[model samples]
Target chain A: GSLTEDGLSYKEKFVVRSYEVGSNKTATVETIANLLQEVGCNHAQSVGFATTTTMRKLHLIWVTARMHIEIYKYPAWGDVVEIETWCQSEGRIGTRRDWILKDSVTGEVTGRATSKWVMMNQDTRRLQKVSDDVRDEYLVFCPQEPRLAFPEENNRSLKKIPKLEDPAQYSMIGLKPRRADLDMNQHVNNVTYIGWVLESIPQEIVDTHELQVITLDYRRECQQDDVVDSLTTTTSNDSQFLHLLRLSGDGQEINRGTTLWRKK
Target chain B: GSLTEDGLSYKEKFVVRSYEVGSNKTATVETIANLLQEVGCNHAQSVGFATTTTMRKLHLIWVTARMHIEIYKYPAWGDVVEIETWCQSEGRIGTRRDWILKDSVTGEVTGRATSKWVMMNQDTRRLQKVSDDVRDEYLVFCPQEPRLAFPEENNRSLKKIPKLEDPAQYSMIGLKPRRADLDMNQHVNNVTYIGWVLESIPQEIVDTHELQVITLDYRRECQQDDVVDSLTTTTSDSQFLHLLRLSGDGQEINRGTTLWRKK
Candidate 1:
C-alpha cells in the first residue's frame, strides 16, 4: 500500500520474483538495491514531493554517493520480503535514508542498509544544495534522526582507497558491459556494478560465506560495450575482502568496494 | 496476499520491476512468463498441492511442451499488472493452463496466454500419465473446462514448419549469453530467447513497425557461456518473418517469429 496511516514510515510488501534470484538461488544484491530505489521513489511521492516523471522533466534528481549494507540472510525464490524505510536530512546539502528488510513469513530481519544522497541538477550535470524550500517540504519526515548512519571515518576511508592493480593479489575476471546494464540514463546503473562484484567473487567463497557487511564507492561511470575487469582479494583471516572494478585496458577504476562475511 | 479464498482462480498484483523491463521500457515477454509461472505455482500451493521443492523431493515436475502468447499491449515501468490464471486437463497425459493479464488501474485486458504441460518423472526423465490421485487433487479448479482451446491445426502447423538456412535472406547478429540470462537451473531462461528475437530484428524495421503477434518454439536451452547467432528472415509476404537461433559452433537453439504492422 502507501505509508503507514500516520506517516511515521513507509512500508510495502514485495514478492521475490524468479528473475531476482542469482546463482545461489537467493535474492541478488542488485535486486535489493532496486527495492530500495522503489521505496525511495514511493516514499517521496507519498510525502508530496515531485513524482519521478516530474523530477526527470525538471532535471532534478537525488544521487547516491555512498552506501553500507548488512545482509543477515538471503531470501530464496517464492519468498516475500517486506521493506520499511524512513528518511532524515543530513548536512545542508545531503539526506540520509535507512531501511529494514523483514521476512514476511517468519518475521525475521533479513537485511538492513543506510545510504547518503545528494541533490543533482541533471541539466548542469552538477551536485546542488538541498535548498531550504526543498527541506521545508520534506522536513516533516526528518523530525527525529536516523536509525543507522555510515561511519564518518568509514566514508572518508573509502575515498582514500587507492587504485589497485597486480593480478597476483586478487581474483580477476574480465567483464564486457552490455546494453542491458544501462538504465534510462546512458550511464550504467549502480545496481549493475554491485552485480559485477558478486560475479567476480571466487565461487568457493560465495558458496561458503554469507555476506554481512558491504561498502561500495562509485568512482567513474562505465559505458556500454566497455570491457572491464572485476578484481577481488581475500584477507589472510578470511573475514575481509577488497574489491575493485576498472577498465581492463587503462586500469582506471570504475568502482571500489569491501565486504565482510560470516560462515554460511 | 495469495489467491483468493476457495481457490476458484488465483490473482496477484505486480509492479513492473526495473530488471524486468527491456529496451522498450515495458515488461519483457520473459518477465510476464516468470509472473505466470509464479502465479501457477502459488495457485497450486494455495489449494494444498506440493510446491516445486516438494515436487522435486517426490521426483515429480511439470514441463512446458508448448505455449502461445498474444500481447495486446505491454505494461510500462512502475505500472502494476494484475494476473489471473486457471487450469484444465488436456487430452490424456497433459493439462492446459490459460491466463488473462489486465491493467491494475484500467482493468483492460493487456495480454493472454495458453500453454500445454506434461508431468515428468525426475528420476526417469520421461513423460508420465496423469495419476488418478494427482488428478483428483487438482481436478477441482480444472472442472469448468478450458475457456479457449488451440485449434487442432495450430499445433499441427507448428510441427510442419521447415528449417530456413539461407543466411543471405535474414537479418542476423551474434548473441553472447550473459550471467543475467541464466535462471536457477543454470540455463538461459526462456524469456531471454524472446528478448534475443526482438534484439535481432532489424533496427530500421523495429523503429517503424509495431509487433502484433508473437509465436515462438523453444528447441533447446542456451547456457550462460554459450555464444550463439540469432537469424531472422522477412517473408515474401512482408508482414511475417521467420526466425532461428543457432550455436556459434553447432546445434539449433530456438525458432519462432511474429507479425508486425508498419506505422
Candidate 2:
C-alpha cells in the first residue's frame, strides 16, 4: 500500500527538477532537507498535533532540533522521490521523527533520515515540555516499536562536531541572505544553510566528485539581511571535507558539516 | 476546452506557493515571469522548433524584446494560476506571443500579457530575420487579432524612457547577483530584473500600493558577480514611480523604466 499499513505515517511525492540539482544533476542535500521539513509539518497536522485549531488554541509548534541523513543513492533530476514520514514519542520533552526516501517509480529505498524535535511556544519563543494532553494526541499515531534508526555510531560522532576556528584554514565564500532565502517565518529556512555548506566546497572537489554522504549540525538562527561566510577544508588524498558557516561581521559561528564524496 | 478551444495554444497549471509570493502575500511579478518563461520553452520544444538539434542545425533561438503586462487582480498564495500561451507572426522579422493568466479553480481571468520576440543567430548572436519555413511553422498558432493589447499610449511612452543621472532623485537599493540568478544559458534570467525593480521602490510605497501595470525594456545583460545599483524615483503627489538598473561602475547602464498609473 502507498500509505503506511500501520496508520502511523503520511507519504507524499516530489519530482526533482534541473534547477534543484547540484552541478552533479542529482538532488542536493538542501532539496532533500526541504522535503523532510515540509513532510514533517504535513504529517504533524494530520495527526492533530500541529493543526490550525491546535495552533490557535495552543500557539504550539514543533521545531526540528537536529537530524542525521544517510543517502544510499542520490536521485537525479526528473526523478520522483517518495517521502514517508512518521513521528514517535521521545521521553517527555522531545519527539522522534523519521523519513524514508524512496524512488517512487521503482519502489527502491534511496535514503533515510532521523530527526529530533521539541515543542516551541511561538509567543514566548521558548521550548515547552510536552504536556500530558499533547503527548496523548501524538502518542496514538506513533508505533510502539521503532521502524528504523540512524546508525548509533554516526549519530554520536556528528553530534560531537566541533566549531571551526581560524578562517584562514579554508577556502571561503561570502553569502548575503536575501528575501528569497526566507520562509513564511521571516527567518532563513534551515535548508538554506545546507546549500551554503556545499557552496563552500573547493571547486576542484565539486568538479571531480559526487557526494556520498553528508552530516550537518545547525547551531543558530539567521535572520533577514544577515551576511554569512561559508568556509571549507578538504584532504589532499582522501574523499572527505569539512565545512562551517559564520557571520561575516562578528565571526559568530552558525553551522558545521562534514561530507564524503565518491570520485566522478 | 480547458486546453483552449482552438488548437493554437498551450495551457498548464501552477499553484502559487508561499515562497513565490512577496510580503503582500500575492504572487510576485518575477514569479509569474518565471512560469511564463518555462511554459514558453515547453511549448517551443513540443512544436519541434527549438530543440538542441534544431538549434545546432539552424543557428536559431527566440529572444524576448519587450513585454507589457496588465494585472486586474493579483493571485494570492495557495491559489492556482493557469497560464495559456501561443506564438504568432509579427511581420517577417519577429514573432508575437500572448499569455492569459487565469484562476484555474474559478475560471476568472486575472491578468494578461503581450510580448514581442525576434530570432537570433545563436552563433553570431545577431538578430536574424524570420524566414519562410520559420514563418510557416508559427503563423498558424497566432490569432488574426490580438485578444488584448497593452495600451498603445503607454507602450509608446515607456519606450522613450530617460536615463537616470542623479542618484539623489530616487530611493535606492543595492543587489549582488549570485549563483541562483543564472539561467541554463548562464546569463541572469530576465525575471530577476523584475525583483530588483520592485526592490528599488520605497518600502512605504510598496507596502501601500499594489502594482497595476508594468512594462520593461531589458537594455543589457547582467553577468554573474556583477553588482547592480537599483534606483527608483516617485512622483511628488502621486503613487507613480520610475526605476533604473546600472553597474555601480558608472560605466555601463543596464536598463531603464517609466511606470505610469492613476494611483
Candidate 3:
C-alpha cells in the first residue's frame, strides 16, 4: 500500500477469483489478528511517515492507526488469501476505508470490510487529517461504498436476535497478556480484541462448525497487563451469538460483538 | 523453565487460546514462550548482582537465547497458563536451563525445554555474568528438570540447506517491501517468514484438508527492502514440501520444509 500527502491509494494486485463467495472455513479471530498485523505492516509504507521537524516531507514521519474490525468470514489456516483495501474517503475526524479478501486465483471477493480512523505522527504522536494534498496520490484506486445492499428487507430476518441491550452490558475482554502481544511498535495490537471475541465461541460449537457473519464495534482501547472479564450470551444454535464484555481497569466498554456461525 | 543460576527463582503468567497457537488446539511452544516472557521480566529484577548487590533489591534485564522447540502435544485454547523457572547451574559464559508447560488446573506437564545464554544490561545491551550476589536473590527455585525427559536431540536441528541456482531470479520482484517488516532492533523478523510461507500454500492441498509440519533452519539475517524469490517443491500425495528464498543480490539463505497429509 502507498500514500501521498493527499492520501492512501490501493496497491494490492487483486486477481479476483472466479467464485466471489466460495468455501467459508472458520479459524480463530486470533489468527485473523496475526494476519492483520502482517496486513498493517504490508501497508505501513502507505500510512507511516516520520519527519524530524514535522516539516511535511511526509508531514508524519511515523504513523499508526487503532483498528476496529468485525470478522464476516474467517480465513482458514492453509487457505490461499488475496486481500485488497483502499481508503473510502477522508474527513476532518478520520479516514473512511474498505477491504476485500479474495480467493488467490479464482478472483472472488470472499470477505468485505470497512473502517475509519486518523493517522498519527511517529515520534510526536500527533494526528494528521487526510487532505486533498494526499488524496490525489491514488485517485484511480479509491473505492466506492461496498455493495452491502442492505439485507433484502423481508428476507433479512436475523436468526439470532440481539434484542438491543445496555451498552454497559457489552464487553470484549483480554484474559492473558504477553510481550509478543506488543507489536513491533511496542504496543498491544489494535485489532487483537477482534479475534479474542471470535475465539470465544461456545466450546461445543467451536469443535464442529463455521461462521457466516461477525460485526464488531470498537468502544475503547486495550493495553497489556489489563485483566479482562468478558460476558456474552448466544441466542441461536451455533448460528448466532451476541456478546457483551468489559475489559476492566481504567474501566470502559472496549468492544461489543454479534456473530453468526453454522455448518459449512 | 529452570535457569541454572546457583540460586534464583522466577514466576510468570500467560493467556492461551487456539488461534494464537496456529492450531485449532492450544500449543506447547506458545505456552512455553508465554511462560518464559512472563518469568523473564520478573527474573530480570535481581539478575547479575553480587551477593551484596543481590540483597540491594534492584532489578536486572536480559535478552533471549536463540531457541528451538517441538510439540509432543498441543494445549487446547483458553487454557490458563502459568510457568516458573529457576537457576539450576551457572557457568562463565551462560547458564544451563530447563522448562515445563502444564495445565494450570490439572498441572499436567505438556512440554519441557532447556537452553543456555548470558545476561546483559538493559540500557547498554552488554553482557554481565551471574554473580554470587545476584544469584543469591533467586536461590529458592532450582535442582529439578522436567520429568518428561529431554529430546533425543537437545536443541532445534537446522542443517545447511541448499540455495537457489540463479541469483537474479528475485530482482525487481513484484512484492514491494514494507517498513513495518523492519523491527526496532533494525532487522526483518526471523519469524515473519513463517507467515509468508504459510500464506503461500496452494489452495488445492488446503481444499483437500491437509495439516502441515514446518521446520526452518536459520541461515542469515535478512534486512528490509530486499526483494526475495521463493523456491518450493512437493512430494507425492501432497505430503511433503520444501522452501528456499534467495534475496536479491544473490545471498542464498533459509531452508524450510512443510509436510501435509490426511490428518
Candidate 4:
C-alpha cells in the first residue's frame, strides 16, 4: 500500500481469491475485515507508526477496540477491490481508522468500515494512552476534512452492542481456537472473532439472509487456551440480533456484537 | 495463472500476505496448500477443463484422493512465490498433478507438492473412471519429459499413510466445522483437513518442531455437520506421526495422514 499524493490516505488493490469467497460466490465478511486490517496496518507502517524497535522498546502494540462495517455489495471471486484507508485521532487514548472499498473496474463503492484502536503495553497487557510523540508520527497523514465513512446519523447506528445475559435464543459452546487462528502476535486474530460470532446464529437465518451491517465491541483479548461460548439473542426486529462471546469456563466477556440482516 | 508458451505447465506469482503467516513470521503450511489449490483450479479453468456447463451437466467434479508436500524452507511474509504446476495421467481412474515452488526473487526452489485426483459423480457421490474424451481435454498440455518433483527413492517416501485404529496416543474429539470451512461446492474444503490433523498433535512438538513433509490419503468427504475425531499415534521414528480423522458418531474414516517433522 502507498500513501495518496496528498499524503492523506493509503490505498491498495486486491483480487478476491477463490478461497476467500463462500458458497454464494461472494467474499465473506471475514475476508473483507481481514483486507481492511491489512491496509490499515500497511498505512501505519508507511507513516512510521508501526511497531518498530523504538515502539518495541516501549513495549507497545496496537489493538482493536471496536469496529463497524456496512456492506452495500459483496465482491465475487476474481473481482479486484481497491481499498483506501485513513487514520484520525479518536480521543487521548485511542485512534480511529476508516476505509472505503471500491470495485476497481466499475469504480463503485461496495463497502465502508470504521474501527477504533488503542495502544497496549506488550509486557503488562494493559491499555496505554497514545503519547504525543507517538501521535505525531501518524497525525501528519490525517485528513483535515474530518471525514467519516459513517457520518453523523449513520454513525449513531453503531451504538454500543448490548450485553446478552442468560437465556439466549441460540448458543454455541466449547469453541476452541485452531492454531491457524493465531496471528503474528500469538493471539487469536480479530478476524477469527467474527466467525465465532456467526457460529451461534440460527442456520435458517444463514441460509436465507445476508449480513448487511455489523458492529463489534471487542472487550478483551482471547488466548489460545480460552474455550469460547457464542450466544445470540433476537431483538424485537426480526432482522436484528445481539451477540456475545465469552469464556466458557468463567463467563468472562470477550466481545459484544450486533448484526443486521436482509433476505437474500 | 497462465499456461506456459509451450503449453506444458501453468504458473502464477503470489506475495505472501500478513494474515497468511504464523507467529514465526512465515507462511503456514495450510496457506501454501490453499495457494496451490487456487493455481490448480485456475489452470483447469484456463484449459477449458474446469466445471463448465458440460461437466456440470455430467455431474462431475474433481476430488483429491492423495497429496504429498515437502517444504525445503518456509517463505516469509512479503516474499514473492512463483508456482508452476502440470498434470499427467496417474492411471485410468486418476490424474496426478505436480507443482514446483520457487522464491521469485532468488529463484530458489522452496517446496514441491504432488497430488492425485479423481473425478466424482456429484449426484451419485462415487468415483468415476476417466473416459477418453475427458482425458484428452487436459493430456494435450502434459509434458513428454516424464519429469517428477520427487523422483525414485524420494518419491517412495510418500508411502501409504496407514490407519491408526482403536487405541491412540492422543485424540481430539467432537471438533465441529465452522461455516467458513465450506468451499463453493459446499463440501468442507480439503485444506481444512490439514488443520484438523494438527489439532491433535502434542503442543511441545508444535512449538519445537516444524512440519517438513505431509502425506494425506483422503478416503471420504467431510460435511459441515459431521462431528470429527482427530487421532494421532507416534511412529517408531521420532520425527514422524500417523494421524487419522474420522466421524465421531460412527468412527468412519475420513482421512489418513502422515507428517514428518524436523526439529
Candidate 5:
C-alpha cells in the first residue's frame, strides 16, 4: 500500500522536501541548490573510499564539480521524496556515480542524475588513484554499463536561426541584448535568452492563461553586447506556438533557436 | 602571528581553494556557498530559538534584499580566510544584519555585507514581524547602526518614447508590462530586471573589453504586466556611463537607472 518504506538494492531516504511543479521552477537558485545538496551528500558518502593497486593502493573520494541538472518535471510543493544513490566505478578521470530519486508515496521516478568526482588524500590534499580494497567494497553498488556521463558540452558557436523562416509572423518589437545581458561564462545563461523570448510574446496571447510550456533550443552562445534580434510566430492552429532567437553582428550570423508553448 | 583568530569565535575550516577566482576577481559559486555556510553557522549558534515566526526562516535569508555593501576589495583565489557576522538592529520591516570577512593574518576587511531580513517561521510558512528577543540577542555581537536602508525607488514612465524636449544629455527607451515577466510575489526579480538592462545594450558595444562597472538605481515596481514596457538607453565616455529603464504599455511603469565604468 506504500512506496517501499525500505529499498532492496539501493538505499533510500525522503531527504529532499522542496519540489514544486510550475513553469518558473527551474530558474530558482534555491531549488537548484537544494537538489544538488541532496544528491551530493549521497555521492560523497559512497565514494568516500577508493583503492588503487598500481601506485600505493590509492583510496579516494568524490565531490561536486558543477551541477546543471535540467528538471523535466517538478513535484508538488511539500512533496516528500527519496534520493537513492551509490558509487558505480572508479574512473581515471574521476569516480563514476548515479542517482535515482522518487516520490515516497506515489513511487514515481521524480528525477535522476549522473556525475563524476575525484579521490583525494584526506590530509595531504593530494590526488590519489582508486585502491582495490575500497573498489572491492564498493563494487556491489556499481550501476550497469552505459548508465550516463555528464554531457560533453561544446562551446556554442554562432549559427543561423533554424526552423521557422517567416519574417512577417514574428515581431522584434521588444527584442534587445544589453551589455549586462552577460554572465561569467562570457555568454548569456540559456535562461536569460529564454527570458527574451518570453518577453517578446504579444500581449493578447499571454493575457489568456499561464505559460505552461517553455521549450528553448540552444543554438549558439550569445555574448557581451551582442545585440540579439528575436521572432515568435504561430506554427500551428492547435494552440501550439514557436519562437526564435537570432543574433547577427560584424558579418557573423551567431545563432538561432525555436521554442514551443501551449495553452494549459 | 594571527590577527583576529585569537578571539572566541566559531572558526569553521573554510578554504578559498584554486579555481574559485576567474577573470575580474570574480569568485566561484562553490567559494561563495562555502563562505555563506561558515558565516551562517556562526550566526546560528548565537541566535536563540526560532521565533514563533514563518518561512523566511529558509537559509537564503538574503537574496536581492541586500541594500549596499562595499568590497573594500575582493579576496584572491586560494586565500584561506575567516568570515565574521554580527547584528546591527531589528528595524521596522526587517532585521539588520552585517558581515565582516578578513584575511587571517593581515586582518584586512576583504568584504563586508550590510543586509536586512524579514523573519519567517518554518512551522507557519508566513513572514512574521521582527521580534525583540531576536534583535536583542544579535546586539550581543555587533554594536553599530547600519547605514540607513536603501531609499525607496522612483521608476520612469513611458508612453511613446517621450521626447526629451529638453532631453537630459542622453536618449531613453520604454518597455511595456506583460504577465510573463512576473515572479511568485508578482514583482519582477531585481536581478531579472538587471538582466533586462544588460540585454538592452546594443550588440556592437559588447564586442569591446573596455567597459566594466554595472550599477543600478532600481526606482519603481511593476505590480502587473501593464507596467513592463519601460525603455532604457545608454551613454558612454572614457569616465562615465548611465543606463535607464522606464514604465508603460508604451507608457512608464518603472525605471532602472544604471552607471558603468571601464577597467
Candidate 6:
C-alpha cells in the first residue's frame, strides 16, 4: 500500500486467491470484508497512526461500529482488484473511512464500502472517547474536502436496520468460533460475524441469489467461548432480509444487519 | 508459480498475510498447509496432468491418503518463503509429492512435507487403480531420479499412527463444518481436518508447546453436513499424542493422526 491523492488516501492491489472464493467461483463477501480491513489497517500503520505506543499504554484500540458495502460485481478467482481508502472524522468520539474498488485491468468500479469506528479501552472493555492526542496525530491524512463513497443523500435515505425480536423466520443456534476465526487482536474478527449471519439463510436463497448490499451495526465483541445464535427475518419482498446475532445463553445482541440480494 | 529443475519441479513464493497468523504472531500450521495445497494445485494445472478433461469425464479425482510435515520454524507475518514441489509415482495405485520450503532471503530451509495420493472415483466414492492411460499421460513430468524430502531411513522407521479407541482422554464432539470450509469440489477441504484435530488439544499444551511434526492417515472424505467428533489421547511421552476423527453417531473412522510436539 502507498499514499495517494497527495497522501490523503491509501491504495493497494490484491489478487483474489483460490481459497478466497466460494463454490460460485467468485470471491466471497467475507473475503471482500477481510481485504478491506487488511488495507485499512495497513494504511493506518503506514501513516504512523497505528504504531503509536501511547495508544497501547492507554489501552485503546479501534473497533468497527457500523459498516455499509455495495458490490456491483464480485471478482472471480485470479482477478486483480485495486482498492483505495480514505478516512475522515465522524464525530467527537468516532471516525469514518470509505473505500472504492476497481478492476485493475478494465478499470471498472466493482464495489464501495464505508465504515464507522470508535475507540475502546482494551482493559476496561468499554467504549472510549477519542482523545485530542489521538485525533491530531491521525488527522494529517484526512483530506481537506470531505469525500464519500456513497452519496450523502443516499446515506441519509438509507433506513436503519430494525431490531429483529423473537419469532424469526429462520434461526441457526450453537455456532462456535474456530481458532482460525480469531484475528491478531485475539477476538473474533469482524468478517467472521458476516459468515455467522448468513448461516441462517435458506439453502435455496444461497444457491439462487448473490448478495448485493450489506449493512451491519456491531454492538458487542464475541469471545472465543461465546455460543452464538444467528437469526434472520425476511421482508415482504423476496430480495431482502434482516439478520440478528446474539449470545445463545442470554440473548445479548452482538450485531444487527440488513442485506439485499439479486438473482445470480 | 514457475517451473524449475528442468521443468520437473515447480516453485512459488508466498508472503504470509496478517490474518493468517495466530496469537503467537506467526503463520498457523493451517496457513502453511493451505499454501502448500495452492502451489501443488498450481503445479498440477501447469502440467497437462491436472487440466485433462478425460479424468473428469471418467469420474476420476485425486485424493490424499497420507501426509507428513516437519517444521523447523514458522514464518511470521510479512515473511516471504520460497517453496518448491515435485511429484513421482508412489505405487500401482498411488503417487507421491514432496515439498521443500526455505526463507526467500536467507536461503534457510524452514520446513518439508510429503504426501501420498490415490485416484478416487468421484461418483462411486471408492479408490480406483491407476490405469495405464492415466499413468503414461502424467509420468512425462516425473524425473528419472527418485527424490525424497525425507531420508528413506526416516520414512521407513516412522510408525503408523495407532487408532484411538473408546475411553479416549479428551474429545470435542458436535463439530460442524462452516460454509467457508468448503472448497470448489464442495468437500470440506483437507486442511480443515487439521484444524479440527487441534481443536480438542488442551489449552495448556497449545499455549506452551509448538508443533514440530505431524502425520496424518486419511481414510474417508468429510462432507458439509456430517457432524464430526475429534478425539485425542496422550502418549507416555509428553511430546507425543495420538488422535482420531470419526462420525458422531455411527463412529465410522475418518482419519488417524500422530503429532510430535516440542516444549
Index of the highest-TM-score prediction: 6
lDDT of 1 by residue, A56-144 (tens): 55677777777778777778877888898888877576787888899999998888888778877866868878766666666677646
Compared with the real two-chain complex, what DockQ does model 1 have?
A: 0.31
In order, the first chain's TM-score in every candidate is 0.83, 0.85, 0.63, 0.94, 0.43, 0.94
Q: CAPRI band of model 1?
A: acceptable
Candidate 1 lDDT by residue in tens digits, B1-263: 36656567788888886556756778766678778877877777677763244355568877666666777787897898998887887756678787889999999999887776777785676777766656665667664644553446555224434555766255445565555666766667766777676665665675566565666666656666666666677764134445545555557666666777675
Q: Which DockQ values do the candidates obtain, in the order shown? A: 0.31, 0.27, 0.02, 0.74, 0.08, 0.67
Q: What is the TM-score of chain B alone in each candidate?
A: 0.79, 0.82, 0.53, 0.91, 0.47, 0.93
Tens digit per residue, CA lDDT, model 6, A111-229: 99999889988778789787787777667779867788987674622467789978999998888888889887678988889999999889788889988888989999899989899
On lDDT, the candidate that comes out on top is 4
Candidate 5, superposed: residue stretches over 4 Å from native: A1-72, A75-109, A112-145, A148-162, A165-172, A197-220, A232-240, A248-264, B1-22, B28-66, B75-95, B101-108, B115-183, B191-219, B222-263
What is the Å distance of residue B194 in model 5 from its true position? 6.1
B1-263 per-residue lDDT for model 6 (tens digits) = 78995989999998787788888888888999998988997787677546245578797888888878888889988789899999998657678889999999999999999988888888898798777778877888887678889867746224666667778788777778878888865788888888888887787887777877777777777777787788887775254344545555555444455454555
lDDT of each prediction vs. the true structure?
A: 0.70, 0.68, 0.47, 0.83, 0.43, 0.82
Error of 6 at A113 (Å): 1.2
- What is the lDDT, from 0 to 100, of the residue B12 in candidate 3? 44
Cα-lDDT of candidate 3: 0.47
Q: Judged by DockQ, which candidate is best?
A: 4
* Cα deviation of B54, candidate 3, in Å: 54
Q: Looking at model 1 chain A, report the run of 10 residues with the lowest lDDT sum.
A: A153-162
For candidate 1, the TM-score is: 0.81
Clashing pairs in 2: none
lDDT of 4 at A75: 94
Off by over 4 Å in 6: A49-54, A156-158, B49-53, B156-158, B240-247, B258-263
Pitting candidate 1 against candidate 6, the one with the higher lDDT is 6
Candidate 4 or 3, higher DockQ? 4
Model 4, residue B46: distance off in Å is: 1.5
